[PDB]
C-alpha cells in the first residue's frame, strides 16, 4: 500500500531550527494531550531513525512544509529545497510565503519557483503582523496562483492564529468563492469547525482537507470519515503532522478506520499524487 | 401515516422557470452528490409523474414554496396561488418576496395576501441585493408578520447566500430575539451550524426547523434526530426539497429513522397542520 | 464518594429573589424542555426539602453562584456570604460583579474579598448594559484576578446574553490568551459551541468547563464525554444548575456516563477541590 504523508517535517538540516524541534517541551505536551507517545526519532532528532519508522509505517514519501519567517523560528525556502534535493525520492518541498509588502511576496514567489518548488504554503495567522486568509492584501497572490495552476496550502485549522477567529470558516470560504478555480488545501482541516467545513467542501469543489493530527479522537472525527466515504473521497489527504504525531502509531490507527477501500487508496496516496502532478505543471 | 411535505416545488407553471428546472444538469449534480438519483418526474418535468411518485411515497400534501431570485429564477405569486387552487387538496401555497427596500417588500407582501396566500418565504441571501435575514430593511416586514400572525419561512441553511456568513446562526437568532411572537420556519434548518441552531430553537419557542435534504448523510444528522426525540418533537418539519431529492427514496429512508412514534407523527404531519391552522388565522 | 455541585442556587435568602425563583413558569419551560420534571424543592422553595434531595442524590457540597443582574434579578454578595456562613459544610460562596465603570467594579471586588469570598462570577451578557466577556473594560479586572490567583467563573454558554454572539467562543478565547495564568471556569461550558470550545480547552490549559444542565441530551454531549476521558479529565466540573435541573435525576444519569473512574472522581469532586484550594491560596 502506497502512503504519502501530506504533513511531515523531517529532523534534517534547516528543519532542526524550527520550534517543533528547538522546543520539544511544547511539542511533547501536544503529542501527549492528543493521546500519543513522542516518536523516538523526534526525541532523538534522528533522521536515521525517522527513515526506519517511515519504512515500518508504509510511508514512501512526505510533503515537507517549512516557515519562511526570517526570524529564529524559520526554515527558509532555500533550506526546504536543500532537504528535498538531498532525498528527492522521499520529500516533496513546499514553499511558504511570509511577507510585509506585495513586492516582498512576489520576490519570495520568484525564489520559490526558481528553486523548482511548485506548491506554496501560507500561514498568515502566525506572521509578525497576523492576518486572516481572506485579507485583501493576500488576493493578488491568490490571483497569481489561480491563473498559474498553483496549489495553495493554507493553515486554517488548529492554532492557525493568535485566537480562534483565525480558523473561523468564513475566511477560507470567502477565498474559495472569489477564486473558484484555485486548488486549496486546508491544513488541519479547518478543525475545530468541522460541521461548517464539510459544508464548505461540499459547496467549493476545489477545496481539499487535511485534518492530520486533529482527526485523532477529537470533535469532528465522525464527520470527516462520513464525508470521506461519500463526496470527499477525492478531496481528503492523509497526514500525520509528524513530529507532532508519531508515524507508526498514527498510520497504523488510520488504517483501521471505517473508510471504504477505494476512498482509502485516494486518501492515502492518490489525491496527493494528483496534487503533486498539478503542481509539476 | 399522513405525510405533509414542507418543501416541494412541483414541475408546474412558473416553477418551471426557476434554475431548479431550467438547469437540470446543475440540479442532478447536487442530487447525486447527496447520494440520490434524480426523480423521473423532475427529469421529465411531468406533473402526472410527480403526483404518482407522491402517492407511491405516501405523501398526502405538499407545501409549494415560491421563489423570487434574480439569479435563481422567479416564480410569480399568481402562479403559486394558481397551482394550489388547481389542486386544493394536494397543495398549500407559499408566496415569496424579492425586495431591495421596505416599501417594495410591503407592496409584495400585500399582493401575496390579496391572492389568498397566508405564508411567506424569504431567501434574502439570493436576492438581487443579497441581504442577511436580520437586515434592518426587513424589520418592518417582520413587525407586520408578527402583528398579523403570519408565519414566515426563511432560508438560513445550505447555500443561502454568496458565502457561509449568510448561514451563521447569529442572523436568525437576532430576528427571533427581536420578534419573540413571530412564527419562523428555518428552511434547510440553518445547516451546517447544527450544534448552534438546536440552541436557538431551545431558546426561541417559535422557531421551527425543516432540515429537508441536509438531514441526509451529513453533519448534524444525529443532533437533529436527538432534538426530534426531545423538545423539538413539536417544532421539526418533514420536507424533501423536491426536486433536489426524489420523493419516494427520501421518504422511505426518512421513515426508517430512529425517532419516537409520537414525535414521528408530529414531524410528518401534526406540526405542519398546526402551522397551516395558524396561517388560517 | 463525594460530589461537589459546581452550580447550585439554593431556595434561600437573597436567592429567593432571582428570576429563577420568581418566575417558576419560565424556569419550568427550560426544565421540561431538557426532559426533567421540576425538583419538588424548587416548586415549593423549600430549603429543607432541597437538603433532603441533595443527600438522596449523594451531593455533599454546592457552589452558590450569585446573580448580579438587572435582567435576571438580584442576590447581593452579602446574601451569598450569609447563605455560606449559615451552612458552612454545605455551600461555597461565589462573588459576582455587575458594573459600568472600572472604579465601580473594583469597589465590588473589594467588598467580595472583605466578605471572605475568594471566587468571582461574571455574567456581563446579562448586565443592564450587556457586554462580551472580552470587552476591553473587563481587562483590568482580569489582570487583578490573574496577579492575585483568584479563579473567575464566566457565563459564556447558554443564554449568556441577548443573542448567540454572546457565546461565540472567540470571546472567551481572547481572555484566556491574554491572561494565560488566569484560572477560568466557563459556566454552561460555552454550549452550544462544543466542537470549538474543546479546541479552546485544548489550546488554553487554564480553562475549566462546566456544561452543567447542557450536558443533558443535547449536541456536543459526546464531544464533552470524549474529552473528559482524555485531556480534559483534570478540567471538567460536575454541576446541575439546580434549580434548572432536579438534583437526584441529573446526578443518577450523570453517574452512569461512560467516564473512566479516575476521570470520574476528578469531575465529581477532585477538580472542584483543587479550584477551592487555589482560592484558599
Q: What are the DSSP calls for B216-255, one per residue?
A: TTSTTHHHHHHHHTTGGGGSB-----BTSS-HHHHHHHHT
In whole angstroms, give the CA distance from residue A127 to residue A122: 10
| Listed residue (A192, A260, A197, A195) closest to A230, CA to CA | A260
In whole angstroms, give the CA distance from residue C193 to residue B199: 9
C-alpha triplet C187, C189, C194: angle, nearest 5°: 165
Residues of chain C positioned with their CB less than 8 A from the CB of B226: 217-219
Query: Method used for this model?
Result: X-ray
CB of C67 closer than 8 Å to CB of C96: yes
CB of C23 closer than 8 Å to CB of C54: no
Radius of gyration of chain A (CA): 17
> How many CA within 13 A on the CB side of residue B136?
0
Chain A residue closest in CA terms to B166: A170
Looking at CATH, the fold of the domain delimited by C1-281 is given as TIM Barrel (3.20.20)
Q: Measure CA A101 to chain center.
A: 24
| C166: CB partners within 8 A, 6+ apart | C125, C130, C132, C156, C160
What are the helix (H) ranges across chain A? Answer: 19-22, 24-34, 40-43, 47-57, 77-86, 102-114, 139-147, 169-178, 194-203, 221-228, 247-254, 261-265, 271-280
In whole angstroms, give the CA distance from residue B117 to residue C200: 48
Q: Does A211 touch chain B (CB under 8 A)?
A: no
Look at A159 and C203 and tell me if their CB atoms are within 8 Å.
Answer: yes
Considering only CB atoms, A191 lies closest to which of C170, C199, C230, namely C199
| B146: CB partners within 8 A, 6+ apart | B179, B181, B182
The DSSP letter of residue A252 is H
Q: How many beta-carbon contacts under 8 Å exist across A and B?
A: 43
Stretch 17-46 of chain A: residues touching chain B, C-beta under 8 Å: none
Q: Measure CA B219 to chain center.
A: 19
3-class state of residue A94 by DSSP: strand
Residues of chain A positioned with their CB less than 8 A from the CB of B164: 169-170, 173, 196, 199-200
Question: A260-267 — which CB contacts under 8 Å span 24+ positions?
Answer: A260/A229, A260/A233, A262/A233, A263/A228, A263/A229, A263/A233, A263/A236, A265/A1, A266/A233, A266/A234, A266/A236, A267/A228, A267/A233, A267/A236, A267/A237, A267/A238
3-class state of residue A91 by DSSP: strand
In whole angstroms, give the CA distance from residue C40 to residue C33: 17
Pick from A25, A158, A164, A167 the residue to mutate for testing the C interface (most C CBs within 10 Å): A164
What residues are paired with C91 via a beta bridge? Answer: C62
Q: Are strands A59-65 and C91-97 parallel, antiparallel or unpaired?
A: unpaired
CB of C69 closer than 8 Å to CB of C123: yes
Q: How far is CA A195 from CA A67, B226, C35, C147, C215, in A?
A: 29, 16, 26, 38, 19
Cell of C105: 467594579
In whole angstroms, give the CA distance from residue C51 to residue C42: 11
Considering only CB atoms, B226 lies closest to which of C162, C194, C217, namely C217
In whole angstroms, give the CA distance from residue A193 to residue A209: 12
Q: Are strands C91-97 and B91-97 parallel, antiparallel or unpaired?
A: unpaired
CB of C162 closer than 8 Å to CB of C127: no
Q: How far off is chain C from A114, nearest CA to CA, in Å?
A: 38
What residues are paired with B8 via a beta bridge? Answer: B64, B242
Helix A247-254 / helix A47-57 crossing angle, nearest 10 deg: 20
Chain A residue closest in CA terms to B36: A230
| A25: CB partners within 8 A, 6+ apart | none
| Listed residue (B106, B234, B235, B219) closest to B167, CA to CA | B219
In whole angstroms, give the CA distance from residue C136 to residue C26: 33
What residues are paired with C68 via a beta bridge? Answer: C74
* Chain C partners (3+ C-beta pairs within 8 A): A, B
Considering only CB atoms, A195 lies closest to which of B165, B168, B219, namely B219
In whole angstroms, give the CA distance from residue A255 to residue A251: 6
Considering only CB atoms, C164 lies closest to which of B196, B205, B226, namely B196
Considering only CB atoms, C217 lies closest to which of B199, B200, B230, namely B230
Q: How far is CA B10 from CA B37, B61, B103, in A?
A: 17, 12, 30
Give me the DSSP letters along B84-122: HHHSTTTEEEEEEE--SSHHHHHHHHHHHHHTT---EEE
Cell of A220: 469532528
| Listed residue (B75, B180, B71, B176) closest to B117, CA to CA | B75
Q: Does B231 touch chain C (CB under 8 A)?
A: yes
Run of H or E including C152: strand C152-155
CB of A169 closer than 8 Å to CB of A177: no
* Chain B partners (3+ C-beta pairs within 8 A): A, C
Amino acid at each position: 500500500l502506497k502512503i504519502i504523508d501530506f504533513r511531515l517535517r523531517p529532523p534534517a538540516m534547516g528543519f532542526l531550527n524550527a520550534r517543533i524541534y528547538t522546543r520539544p517541551d511544547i511539542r511533547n505536551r501536544f503529542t501527549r494531550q492528543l493521546g500519543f507517545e513522542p516518536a523516538p526519532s523526534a526525541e532523538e532528532k534522528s533522521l536515521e531513525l525517522m527513515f526506519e519508522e517511515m519504512a515500518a509505517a508504509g510511508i514512501e514519501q512526505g510533503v515537507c512544509v517549512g516557515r519562511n519567517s526570517s526570524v529564529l523560528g524559520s526554515v527558509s525556502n532555500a533550506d526546504v529545497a536543500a532537504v528535498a534535493k538531498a532525498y528527492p525520492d522521499k520529500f516533496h518541498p513546499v514553499g511558504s510565503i511570509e511577507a510585509a509588502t506585495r513586492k516582498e511576496a512576489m520576490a519570495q514567489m520568484q525564489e520559490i519557483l526558481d528553486l523548482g518548488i511548485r506548491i506554496v504554503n501560507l500561514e498568515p495567522g502566525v506572521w509578525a503582523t497576523p492576518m486572516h486568509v481572506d485579507d485583501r492584501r493576500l488576493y493578488p497572490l491568490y490571483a497569481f496562483c489561480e491563473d498559474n495552476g498553483i496549489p495553495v496550502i493554507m493553515m486554517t485549522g488548529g492554532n492557525a492564529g493568535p485566537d480562534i477567529t483565525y480558523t473561523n470558516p468564513e475566511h477560507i470560504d470567502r477565498v474559495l468563492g472569489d477564486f473558484p478555480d484555485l486548488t486549496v488545501v486546508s491544513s488541519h482541516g479547518n478543525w475545530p469547525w468541522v460541521q461548517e467545513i464539510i459544508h464548505v467542501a461540499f459547496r467549493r469543489p476545489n477545496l481539499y482537507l487535511s485534518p492530520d493530527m486533529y482527526l485523532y479522537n477529537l470533535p469532528g472525527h465522525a464527520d470527516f470519515i462520513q464525508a470521506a466515504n461519500s463526496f470527499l473521497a477525492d478531496r481528503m489527504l492523509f497526514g500525520t503532522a509528524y513530529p507532532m504525531c508519531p508515524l507508526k502509531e498514527y498510520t497504523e490507527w488510520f488504517l483501521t478506520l471505517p473508510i471504504k477501500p477505494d476512498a482509502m487508496e485516494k486518501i492515502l496516496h492518490g489525491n496527493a499524487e494528483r496534487l503533486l502532478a498539478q503542481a509539476g505543471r
